[PDB]
Design a protein around this motif. Sequence first.
Motif: not given
Lengths: 77, 49
Positions: B7-17
């Motif tokens: 399982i590869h998890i990529k969490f992008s916070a709401g700061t930049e694209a």
Amino acid sequence: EGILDEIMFNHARIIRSELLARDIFQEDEENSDVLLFQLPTTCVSMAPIQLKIDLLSGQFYFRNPTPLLSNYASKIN
Amino acid sequence: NYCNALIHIKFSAGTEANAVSFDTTFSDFKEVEDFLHFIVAEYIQQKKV
């Protein structure tokens, strides 16, 4: 064939009994041919892992080994 | 390998694209659940601040 199977099972049982005497693996009540190794999966969790003996060639193996678990099972072999 | 689960998890916070906050891999579902709970708690804290 029956004699060979009996010898196989007796050798596996002798090895398992030696391991239990060393008190590294705890005894599994449900299965007499399965060894329980205590390992902490997380900081607070403390869980047993089932190791089994191949009845044909005699290499220890895990039920669902991780890559590190598989590597160290091979090291055990 | 046709049997193991990765399982590869990529969490992008709401700061930049493109500023990926976290990008990790997991082979144990227990650690997956632990990190999911941690991410949920972090999101709740962010919503509380």
